[PDB]
User: Fold this.
Amino acid sequence: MNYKISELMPNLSGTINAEVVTAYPKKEFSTKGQLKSLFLKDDTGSIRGTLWNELADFEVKKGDIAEVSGYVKQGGLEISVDNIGIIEKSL
Assistant:
């Protein structure tokens, strides 16, 4: 089932449909990795999302409503993104 952010639990893998409230600058490091953090929100709460490696270059904009699938862990909670798609563009 699709989850509301308030329903997320640690060590849980699921999908949430949420608004990108913020998209932070991509960070590159070392044989090669990348990180792009997102702050996601729905009508029940907010959570940090982490886009790794190639997904750090995924075209996402503030205001976009995205389908984010991933693993929830304590970082409070954060979702390590496995897959992301745009449901409705900010525009």
Observations:
- The first strand starts at residue 2 and ends at 3.
- The chain is about 0% helix and 65% strand.
- Residues 56 and 86 are 14 Å apart (CA to CA).
